[PDB]
Protein backbone atom coordinates (compact mmCIF):
# COMPACT_ATOMS: atom_id res chain seq x y z
CA UNK A 1 0.00 0.00 0.00
CA UNK A 2 1.97 2.95 -1.36
CA UNK A 3 1.09 6.53 -0.50
CA UNK A 4 2.19 8.76 2.32
CA UNK A 5 -0.02 8.37 5.37
CA UNK A 6 -1.93 11.34 6.72
CA UNK A 7 0.13 13.03 9.43
CA UNK A 8 -2.19 13.78 12.34
CA UNK A 9 0.81 14.23 14.64
CA UNK A 10 0.84 18.06 15.05
CA UNK A 11 -2.29 17.86 17.20
CA UNK A 12 -0.81 15.18 19.47
CA UNK A 13 2.13 17.42 20.39
CA UNK A 14 1.61 20.75 22.14
CA UNK A 15 -1.32 22.68 23.50
CA UNK A 16 -4.36 22.72 21.20
CA UNK A 17 -5.27 26.35 20.59
CA UNK A 18 -8.40 28.15 21.71
CA UNK A 19 -11.52 27.95 19.52
CA UNK A 20 -11.05 31.33 17.82
CA UNK A 21 -7.46 30.34 16.85
CA UNK A 22 -8.44 26.88 15.63
CA UNK A 23 -5.53 24.99 14.12
CA UNK A 24 -6.13 23.95 10.51
CA UNK A 25 -4.56 20.87 8.89
CA UNK A 26 -5.32 20.24 5.22
CA UNK A 27 -4.78 16.91 3.51
CA UNK A 28 -4.66 16.66 -0.30
CA UNK A 29 -3.03 13.31 -0.96
CA UNK A 30 -3.24 10.80 1.84
CA UNK A 31 -3.97 7.44 3.24
CA UNK A 32 -5.98 8.18 6.39
CA UNK A 33 -7.53 6.32 9.34
CA UNK A 34 -10.10 8.30 11.36
CA UNK A 35 -10.69 5.32 13.62
CA UNK A 36 -6.95 5.39 14.42
CA UNK A 37 -7.11 9.04 15.38
CA UNK A 38 -10.27 8.67 17.47
CA UNK A 39 -9.14 5.60 19.39
CA UNK A 40 -6.72 7.92 21.20
CA UNK A 41 -9.44 10.15 22.71
CA UNK A 42 -12.72 9.57 24.56
CA UNK A 43 -15.24 10.81 22.00
CA UNK A 44 -18.38 12.30 23.54
CA UNK A 45 -20.37 13.49 20.52
CA UNK A 46 -19.73 13.02 16.81
CA UNK A 47 -22.27 14.88 14.69
CA UNK A 48 -22.08 15.53 10.96
CA UNK A 49 -23.78 17.63 8.28
CA UNK A 50 -24.64 16.23 4.83
CA UNK A 51 -22.57 13.12 5.70
CA UNK A 52 -22.56 10.55 8.51
CA UNK A 53 -19.76 9.36 10.81
CA UNK A 54 -19.64 5.98 9.06
CA UNK A 55 -19.33 7.58 5.62
CA UNK A 56 -16.79 10.26 6.60
CA UNK A 57 -14.16 7.63 7.47
CA UNK A 58 -15.05 5.36 4.55
CA UNK A 59 -14.63 7.51 1.43
CA UNK A 60 -12.06 9.09 -0.88
CA UNK A 61 -11.83 12.89 -1.09
CA UNK A 62 -9.91 15.42 -3.10
CA UNK A 63 -9.05 17.21 0.15
CA UNK A 64 -9.63 16.68 3.87
CA UNK A 65 -9.44 19.52 6.38
CA UNK A 66 -9.10 18.98 10.14
CA UNK A 67 -9.63 21.81 12.63
CA UNK A 68 -8.84 21.12 16.31
CA UNK A 69 -8.82 23.32 19.38
CA UNK A 70 -9.39 23.33 23.11
CA UNK A 71 -13.11 23.24 23.80
CA UNK A 72 -14.99 22.33 26.99
CA UNK A 73 -17.90 19.91 26.94
CA UNK A 74 -19.92 22.33 29.08
CA UNK A 75 -20.39 24.47 25.93
CA UNK A 76 -21.55 21.63 23.69
CA UNK A 77 -24.86 23.43 23.30
CA UNK A 78 -23.29 26.34 21.40
CA UNK A 79 -21.17 24.21 19.01
CA UNK A 80 -23.37 23.10 16.10
CA UNK A 81 -23.55 23.87 12.40
CA UNK A 82 -26.93 25.64 12.32
CA UNK A 83 -26.00 27.13 15.67
CA UNK A 84 -26.68 30.65 16.87
CA UNK A 85 -24.35 30.45 19.87
CA UNK A 86 -21.47 32.92 20.24
CA UNK A 87 -19.04 30.26 19.03
CA UNK A 88 -20.46 29.81 15.56
CA UNK A 89 -21.12 33.58 15.49
CA UNK A 90 -17.70 35.10 16.23
CA UNK A 91 -15.34 32.16 16.84
CA UNK A 92 -15.51 29.18 14.46
CA UNK A 93 -17.83 28.43 11.51
CA UNK A 94 -17.42 25.69 8.91
CA UNK A 95 -18.62 25.53 5.32
CA UNK A 96 -22.22 25.33 4.18
CA UNK A 97 -21.54 23.83 0.75
CA UNK A 98 -19.29 21.04 2.00
CA UNK A 99 -19.92 17.88 4.02
CA UNK A 100 -19.08 18.63 7.60
CA UNK A 101 -18.47 17.01 10.97
CA UNK A 102 -18.08 18.31 14.49
CA UNK A 103 -16.45 16.15 17.18
CA UNK A 104 -16.16 16.61 20.92
CA UNK A 105 -13.72 14.32 22.69
CA UNK A 106 -11.82 14.23 25.96
CA UNK A 107 -8.11 13.38 26.01
CA UNK A 108 -7.63 10.52 28.55
CA UNK A 109 -4.78 9.77 30.94
CA UNK A 110 -3.14 7.54 28.29
CA UNK A 111 -2.07 10.81 26.51
CA UNK A 112 0.53 12.93 28.30
CA UNK A 113 1.94 14.76 25.25
CA UNK A 114 -1.04 17.13 24.88
CA UNK A 115 -0.50 19.98 27.34
CA UNK A 116 -3.29 22.04 28.91
CA UNK A 117 -3.96 25.77 28.66
CA UNK A 118 -4.77 27.81 31.72
CA UNK A 119 -8.44 28.10 30.81
CA UNK A 120 -10.93 27.81 27.99
CA UNK A 121 -11.30 31.05 26.03
CA UNK A 122 -13.70 32.23 23.37
CA UNK A 123 -14.85 35.54 21.91
CA UNK A 124 -18.35 36.49 22.96
CA UNK A 125 -18.62 39.71 20.93
CA UNK A 126 -16.65 41.14 18.01
CA UNK A 127 -18.04 44.19 16.24
CA UNK A 128 -16.98 47.14 14.18
CA UNK A 129 -17.82 50.81 14.49
CA UNK A 130 -17.45 53.29 11.67
CA UNK A 131 -15.95 56.74 12.22
CA UNK A 132 -18.72 59.06 10.95
CA UNK A 133 -21.60 56.76 11.99
CA UNK A 134 -21.34 54.93 15.28
CA UNK A 135 -23.62 52.14 14.11
CA UNK A 136 -22.26 48.84 15.32
CA UNK A 137 -21.69 46.11 12.73
CA UNK A 138 -21.06 42.76 14.45
CA UNK A 139 -18.34 40.92 12.53
CA UNK A 140 -20.06 37.57 12.15
CA UNK A 141 -17.22 35.24 11.28
CA UNK A 142 -17.32 33.80 7.80
CA UNK A 143 -17.07 30.09 7.07
CA UNK A 144 -13.52 28.63 7.24
CA UNK A 145 -12.09 32.07 8.16
CA UNK A 146 -10.91 33.59 11.41
CA UNK A 147 -12.57 36.37 13.31
CA UNK A 148 -11.23 39.79 12.32
CA UNK A 149 -10.79 40.16 16.08
CA UNK A 150 -8.01 37.57 16.18
CA UNK A 151 -5.72 40.52 15.46
CA UNK A 152 -6.49 42.07 18.86
CA UNK A 153 -7.61 39.22 21.17
CA UNK A 154 -4.70 37.27 22.69
CA UNK A 155 -4.17 33.51 22.57
CA UNK A 156 -5.95 33.14 25.90
CA UNK A 157 -8.46 35.33 27.72
CA UNK A 158 -7.05 36.50 31.01
CA UNK A 159 -10.21 37.42 32.92
CA UNK A 160 -13.82 36.78 32.06
CA UNK A 161 -14.74 40.32 31.10
CA UNK A 162 -11.66 41.52 29.24
CA UNK A 163 -12.23 44.15 26.57
CA UNK A 164 -10.02 44.62 23.52
CA UNK A 165 -10.06 47.41 21.00
CA UNK A 166 -8.23 48.67 17.97
CA UNK A 167 -8.58 51.84 15.95
CA UNK A 168 -8.91 51.40 12.20
CA UNK A 169 -7.06 53.25 9.43
CA UNK A 170 -8.85 56.04 7.49
CA UNK A 171 -8.66 53.74 4.48
CA UNK A 172 -11.16 51.25 5.94
CA UNK A 173 -13.37 53.98 7.43
CA UNK A 174 -11.34 55.05 10.44
CA UNK A 175 -13.66 53.34 12.91
CA UNK A 176 -12.95 51.14 15.91
CA UNK A 177 -12.60 47.34 15.98
CA UNK A 178 -13.75 45.91 19.30
CA UNK A 179 -13.85 42.47 20.94
CA UNK A 180 -14.77 41.01 24.34
CA UNK A 181 -13.09 38.00 25.84
CA UNK A 182 -14.90 35.35 27.81
CA UNK A 183 -13.43 32.46 29.77
CA UNK A 184 -14.18 28.97 31.08
CA UNK A 185 -12.25 27.32 33.89
CA UNK A 186 -9.86 24.61 32.75
CA UNK A 187 -10.85 21.04 33.58
CA UNK A 188 -8.78 18.22 35.06
CA UNK A 189 -8.90 16.39 31.76
CA UNK A 190 -8.41 18.62 28.74
CA UNK A 191 -11.44 18.61 26.47
CA UNK A 192 -11.14 19.35 22.77
CA UNK A 193 -13.14 19.94 19.63
CA UNK A 194 -12.50 18.74 16.10
CA UNK A 195 -13.97 19.95 12.84
CA UNK A 196 -13.84 17.97 9.61
CA UNK A 197 -14.60 19.42 6.21
CA UNK A 198 -14.18 17.37 3.04
CA UNK A 199 -14.16 18.09 -0.69
CA UNK A 200 -14.96 15.42 -3.21
CA UNK A 201 -13.25 16.02 -6.50
CA UNK A 202 -15.02 15.83 -9.84
CA UNK A 203 -12.18 13.70 -11.21
CA UNK A 204 -9.72 12.65 -8.49
CA UNK A 205 -10.19 11.71 -4.86
CA UNK A 206 -6.73 10.98 -3.51
CA UNK A 207 -7.27 11.24 0.24
CA UNK A 208 -8.35 7.66 0.73
CA UNK A 209 -8.91 5.47 3.78
CA UNK A 210 -6.61 2.90 5.43
CA UNK A 211 -8.03 -0.32 3.88
Amino acid sequence: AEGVECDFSPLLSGTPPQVYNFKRLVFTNCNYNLTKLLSLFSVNDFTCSQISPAAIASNCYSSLILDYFSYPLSMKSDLSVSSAGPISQFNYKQSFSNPTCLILATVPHNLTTITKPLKYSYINKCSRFLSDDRTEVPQLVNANQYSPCVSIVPSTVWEDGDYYRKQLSPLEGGGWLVASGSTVAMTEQLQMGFGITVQYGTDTNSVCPKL
Partner: nanobody, 119 residues
Framework: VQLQESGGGSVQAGGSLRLSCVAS????????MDWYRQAPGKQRELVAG???????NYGDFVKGRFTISRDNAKNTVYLQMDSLKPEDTAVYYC??????????????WGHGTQVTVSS
Protein backbone atom coordinates in the same frame (compact mmCIF):
# COMPACT_ATOMS: atom_id res chain seq x y z
CA VAL B 1 -15.61 58.04 41.44
CA GLN B 2 -12.44 60.19 41.25
CA LEU B 3 -9.49 60.53 38.84
CA GLN B 4 -6.39 62.48 39.83
CA GLU B 5 -3.53 63.57 37.59
CA SER B 6 0.12 64.38 38.24
CA GLY B 7 3.20 65.13 36.17
CA GLY B 8 1.99 68.20 34.29
CA GLY B 9 4.29 71.14 33.77
CA SER B 10 6.18 73.13 31.20
CA VAL B 11 8.85 71.40 29.14
CA GLN B 12 10.91 72.77 26.29
CA ALA B 13 10.43 71.28 22.77
CA GLY B 14 11.85 67.78 22.20
CA GLY B 15 12.04 66.94 25.90
CA SER B 16 10.26 64.16 27.73
CA LEU B 17 7.53 64.10 30.36
CA ARG B 18 5.37 61.59 32.23
CA LEU B 19 1.82 62.10 33.51
CA SER B 20 0.15 59.86 36.03
CA CYS B 21 -3.52 59.26 36.79
CA VAL B 22 -4.39 57.38 39.96
CA ALA B 23 -8.03 56.25 40.01
CA SER B 24 -9.36 56.43 43.56
CA UNK B 25 -12.63 55.35 42.09
CA UNK B 26 -15.42 53.59 43.89
CA UNK B 27 -15.53 50.93 41.20
CA UNK B 28 -13.13 48.63 39.43
CA UNK B 29 -15.75 48.28 36.67
CA UNK B 30 -13.70 50.55 34.45
CA UNK B 31 -12.96 48.57 31.32
CA UNK B 32 -10.66 51.12 29.72
CA MET B 33 -8.91 54.32 30.72
CA ASP B 34 -7.89 56.93 28.24
CA TRP B 35 -5.82 60.11 27.92
CA TYR B 36 -7.25 63.12 26.14
CA ARG B 37 -5.88 66.57 25.50
CA GLN B 38 -7.49 69.90 24.62
CA ALA B 39 -5.33 72.40 22.77
CA PRO B 40 -6.25 76.14 22.86
CA GLY B 41 -9.47 76.15 20.89
CA LYS B 42 -9.31 72.72 19.25
CA GLN B 43 -11.67 69.86 19.96
CA ARG B 44 -10.81 67.62 22.86
CA GLU B 45 -8.97 64.77 21.17
CA LEU B 46 -7.87 61.29 22.22
CA VAL B 47 -4.14 60.79 22.84
CA ALA B 48 -3.82 57.29 24.28
CA GLY B 49 -5.88 54.51 25.76
CA UNK B 50 -5.49 51.18 27.49
CA UNK B 51 -8.11 48.57 28.11
CA UNK B 52 -9.24 45.77 30.33
CA UNK B 53 -7.59 43.33 27.92
CA UNK B 54 -4.38 45.32 27.81
CA UNK B 55 -4.74 46.31 24.15
CA UNK B 56 -2.96 49.63 23.78
CA ASN B 57 -4.17 52.23 21.31
CA TYR B 58 -2.95 55.75 20.56
CA GLY B 59 -4.01 58.97 18.89
CA ASP B 60 -3.13 59.54 15.27
CA PHE B 61 -0.57 62.28 15.96
CA VAL B 62 1.91 60.53 18.24
CA LYS B 63 4.55 58.73 16.17
CA GLY B 64 5.48 56.17 18.77
CA ARG B 65 6.53 59.03 21.04
CA PHE B 66 3.94 58.41 23.72
CA THR B 67 3.64 55.18 25.66
CA ILE B 68 0.82 54.28 28.05
CA SER B 69 1.03 51.78 30.87
CA ARG B 70 -1.06 50.57 33.79
CA ASP B 71 -0.18 48.59 36.88
CA ASN B 72 -3.48 47.35 38.32
CA ALA B 73 -1.68 46.85 41.66
CA LYS B 74 -1.50 50.61 42.26
CA ASN B 75 -4.74 51.64 40.48
CA THR B 76 -2.76 53.99 38.30
CA VAL B 77 -2.05 54.64 34.62
CA TYR B 78 1.09 56.30 33.29
CA LEU B 79 1.59 58.15 30.00
CA GLN B 80 5.26 58.71 29.23
CA MET B 81 5.75 61.27 26.45
CA ASP B 82 9.03 61.60 24.56
CA SER B 83 10.24 63.97 21.84
CA LEU B 84 7.54 66.46 22.68
CA LYS B 85 6.97 69.28 20.23
CA PRO B 86 5.16 72.63 20.64
CA GLU B 87 2.09 71.14 18.92
CA ASP B 88 1.67 68.86 21.98
CA THR B 89 0.90 71.90 24.17
CA ALA B 90 -2.59 71.31 25.59
CA VAL B 91 -4.46 70.52 28.79
CA TYR B 92 -4.35 66.75 29.18
CA TYR B 93 -7.07 64.80 30.99
CA CYS B 94 -7.35 61.16 31.95
CA UNK B 95 -10.73 59.48 31.69
CA UNK B 96 -12.37 56.21 32.62
CA UNK B 97 -14.92 54.16 30.69
CA UNK B 98 -17.54 52.23 32.63
CA UNK B 99 -18.87 49.41 30.49
CA UNK B 100 -17.26 51.05 27.48
CA UNK B 101 -17.91 49.43 24.12
CA UNK B 102 -16.76 50.82 20.81
CA UNK B 103 -15.82 54.50 20.42
CA UNK B 104 -14.64 56.05 23.70
CA UNK B 105 -17.50 57.82 25.48
CA UNK B 106 -15.95 58.38 28.89
CA UNK B 107 -18.19 58.33 31.94
CA UNK B 108 -15.69 59.88 34.41
CA TRP B 109 -13.12 62.64 33.74
CA GLY B 110 -10.29 64.19 35.73
CA HIS B 111 -9.63 67.86 36.52
CA GLY B 112 -6.86 67.92 33.89
CA THR B 113 -3.21 68.81 34.16
CA GLN B 114 -1.56 71.18 31.70
CA VAL B 115 1.57 70.57 29.63
CA THR B 116 3.26 73.42 27.77
CA VAL B 117 6.08 73.12 25.21
CA SER B 118 8.40 76.02 24.23
CA SER B 119 10.87 75.92 21.32
Amino acid sequence: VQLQESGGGSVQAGGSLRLSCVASGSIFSINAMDWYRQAPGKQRELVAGITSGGSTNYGDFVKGRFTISRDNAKNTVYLQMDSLKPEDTAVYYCAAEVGGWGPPRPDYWGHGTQVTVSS
